[PDB]
């Protein structure tokens, strides 16, 4: 039996497949960061990072669904082993913010390419992912600002972790 | 600051971390199988395997949560790129059933090691996973039985797919 | 008394008027394909196609609305008689799939042209149309995939027409 | 496979098909009339005529449904480009009123022919259409009467348009 | 303490801050136009323009919120004293329509610069403003059309004002 | 057509017009203060100051409405560019408190003048603005006291910002 060919172009397909893989690699990094937090008495950040990892996995799932609906093969490659050694809460969120910047940029690249290809079906699809990612990027900026404002004198780590715990619970 | 040590023993920790990575590998193989289905007109199987893949990741997450609560560092390894090429619906489900059999034995091995090293907190936490995994294994057996009963003469494939679609929709 | 000039530019105006006429054309072609179906015992496909025709005409209306609100005169041209002879269920849905592909492209062209001329009012207006059209194009791909999976052995036509009836009942 | 032959007679079939084409032609004429009004600061009449154009299209769909149900092929022919230049509001509604009288007459002719041929299934079907068309004819007569009562010295045009706008909102 | 850098580029920041100040200038011109209306017995126009001025300030606030969330300093300049003298209702609405045209182009220019520098978070945030501004521009076109249709012979002004009053009350 | 003259005296008119302008200049200063906060990791104060700016703009709007109702021309002059450089959270609220004192005094001056002119309509109108302003002045005193009580050792800025954030949210 004959199945219709992929409804997207080759280049867009490769970009989307790679984006799936990035979100999965993010999801695992955030779980590793979360574990670091949980095993260094920072369960606030641990919870926050664990839930954020599931958001990133949710993005991968949504990209997959869009691939499936366009009859495009999802070609999953490996998910890299995440970094597991960290210096502290601040460094974790500094790395997290940098990652979220990289992810926003990776989406921009696909969106841009959609515009050049005049693939507006894909452009239109992504816009929801653009908006969501922007809010995530802003969130990590805010958390990082806050961790840095509090500092790590005496009870500062505890205060930071309680602040993040509040965000985790708010965003449920 | 001092954070308490891991509350489980070295050997249990190794088995549990192995199982997390194993569930993640399975999850991605199911995603790949799902995509094959979606790109060969079998959207019922497609959906079924997509939802099943998501549920295997949920198992990995549940193990991670248990690890975190016990102050055990999660050790996420690289997740293997799944097989992308399959011969047809029957062979996907034979390979899936065989995988679920292996996952059931993996879990049995951890539970056995818990009994033997007298870790009943772990024994007890795992029971819920034993029961859920057993239902998943039976389900794959039943799907395979049905695929084999229908055959692929004439519109056997369509019928098999619609049947699988019904299962997927009833489980949501 | 003086009425404000058209709020869109000449090129955009022409492309939008041409799209109005094309949607009217496509509506009539789907009506004709629907009638073929109904007069050859395929009332599932006849309903589906009738309701789709109605929806093409709704797209026409929405374009007209946008033209009116911008003080742009609507220039309806002749609608040519649609094709009325067809070879069968598969060939109708093959043709309709190709028409949907062509419509998706005709819209991508308008959108590109909006971007190009910085008419973002019109870009923003079209995005709902891009989204809807994508879902229609996807739907015809899925219906054509299912018809080809089922085939026209024995009661294949019946099964395929009943599947399409299911779709039609579901979309209402 | 054998599909049952048309349930209606040749003559009725031709008259119903030519009525479908007339209603589609009317719909487009009404759209063109609406556009003239919207582009000459007469949005009351613009709305009114657009909505009336949609209703004429619904009449065409209902005739098509009847044909499909009787296993009669629908034969859509060319729909001619409507007139797009008009002299003013009064002329538009004079021309519309004349068209509605012609529409009423063409329906009367089909009903007469059903009686002659003792097609009472058709006669019975047409009754709802006779009733609705008479309501539409009266409506156009009433709007024309009001347009002629108001005049176009001096803010006559505005008052007429506001009155028509009131009707459009009331009927929807 | 270190606070993260502005998340947007220099050129976008300049365009956005320019737009904030531009919306504030417009807002005050609308307030001034409103007052002229209120002091020349045109309280319908008065209300309409007051509410519209308040809504332009809301646009400035929405831009500011976006700037704040991106860690971009808001640069508020002096806001120009508006024109206080006008010739009449028609000339107020001609000048208002011309302003809305300019505001629509200003926004188009920012959106275009976002596409070009691949800032889609900004592109995406702005779309909502494009759509709202388009509706505002159409509204001013429609009001001007109506003012021009009614004229100012006899109680044309009263009628125009009452019409505008109706619009203002329906939009609250 | 003849419009009634202003129902207020010249001196009161000039005072009220100036008060409109002061509240607008306040609104923009508070937004500048708010931006400073938001770009120095103080989003609590940023939110609080942003919302307070909208309260000040609301006062300007209410003064405007009273002018309009008395047939008094609103003669808007420029809104000065606000200060944008600040040393810290304490200095911001020290400047804010001083401003609120100046604003309370400016209202007293108009109220006083109303008493001397025996303009009791205006005296009565303002009393609501007197009460509101007094509560605002007390608020800034309280916030300033609190910021000064907390200090800016280690985590003091964070604690102050969280305290203010609590007020912002309370007052919504
Ligand atoms: Fe399983
Ligand atoms: Fe009148
Ligand atoms: Fe505007």
From Swiss-Prot, chains A, B, C, D, E, F:
It catalyses: 4 Fe(2+) + O2 + 6 H2O = 4 iron(III) oxide-hydroxide + 12 H(+). Its EC number is 1.16.3.2. Pfam families: Ferritin. InterPro entries: Ferritin (IPR001519), Ferritin-like (IPR012347), Ferritin-like_diiron (IPR009040), Ferritin-like_SF (IPR009078), Ferritin_DPS_dom (IPR008331), Ferritin_prok (IPR041719). The keyword Cell cycle does not apply. Fe cation 2 binds at residues 56, 100, 133. CDD domains: Nonheme_Ferritin (cd01055). SUPFAM superfamilies: Ferritin-like. It is an enzyme of class 1 (oxidoreductase). Keywords: Cytoplasm, Iron, Iron storage, Metal-binding, Oxidoreductase. GO terms for cellular component: cytosol. It is found in: Cytoplasm. Iron-storage protein. Belongs to the ferritin family. Prokaryotic subfamily. Homooligomer of 24 subunits that assemble into a spherical protein shell (12 +/- 1 nM diameter) that can sequester at least 2000 iron atoms. This is Bacterial non-heme ferritin. It comes from Helicobacter pylori (strain J99 / ATCC 700824) (Campylobacter pylori J99).
